[PDB]
Amino acid sequence: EFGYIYRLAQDYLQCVLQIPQPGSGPSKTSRVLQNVAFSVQKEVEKNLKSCLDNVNVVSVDTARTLFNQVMEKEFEDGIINWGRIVTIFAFEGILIKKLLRQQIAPDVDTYKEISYFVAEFIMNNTGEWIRQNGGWENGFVKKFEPK
Numbered sequence: 001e002f003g004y005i006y007r008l009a010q011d012y013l014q015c016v017l018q019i020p021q022p023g024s025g026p027s028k029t030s031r032v033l034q035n036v037a038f039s040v041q042k043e044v045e046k047n048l049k050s051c052l053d054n055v056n057v058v059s060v061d062t063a064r065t066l067f068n069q070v071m072e073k074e075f076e077d078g079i080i081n082w083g084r085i086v087t088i089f090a091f092e093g094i095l096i097k098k099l100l101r102q103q104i105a106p107d108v109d110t111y112k113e114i115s116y117f118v119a120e121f122i123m124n125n126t127g128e129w130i131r132q133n134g135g136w137e138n139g140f141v142k143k144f145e146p147k
């Protein structure tokens, strides 16, 4: 469901921005996802250090355009798997870091619009596959939770 995925995307951005929501904290699924997607994010950032400077993420519309282009490329072969889904979260982490630095008239609520378009992409493009492969709780978590 959209709301569940939106919460994962918002939790991940709040984790990257070092502002986890005060309170009882993220779910077990969200905690597992943060760990595994951050490992991906850091390696992507290291490998792509040169080209990450080729954009200036001045607005949320710039971030959405980059997101659409990168994800159309990422899924061009039609293969959906958990690795690619994790990479979506790693990529929104890179985008939010660039927006924090580069957004004109920064808006501390920006991570909520990025979470929305991330959830929209995941739902509409990978949602069926996710359900058929166990959902987050019987698919993703079972595969990636600590040994």
Ligand SMILES: *CCC(=O)N(c1ccc(O[C@@H]2CC[C@@H](NC(=O)N[C@@H]3CCS(=O)(=O)C3)C2)c(Cl)c1)[C@@H](C)c1ccc(Cl)cc1
Pocket (backbone or CB within 6 Å): 044, 048, 051, 052, 053, 054, 055, 057, 066, 070, 074, 082, 083, 084, 085, 087, 091, 094, 095, 098
């Ligand atoms: C030098 C690249 C470049 O100019 N840009 C770019 C392109 C793609 C990016 O990220 C995608 C998402 C992470 C990485 N994909 C994978 O690692 N996928 C493997 C194979 C499938 S898997 O098993 O799931 C893992 C490539 C980035 Cl971060 C950057 C630009 C288009 C660019 C530059 C800066 C920003 Cl902020 C956005 C885009």
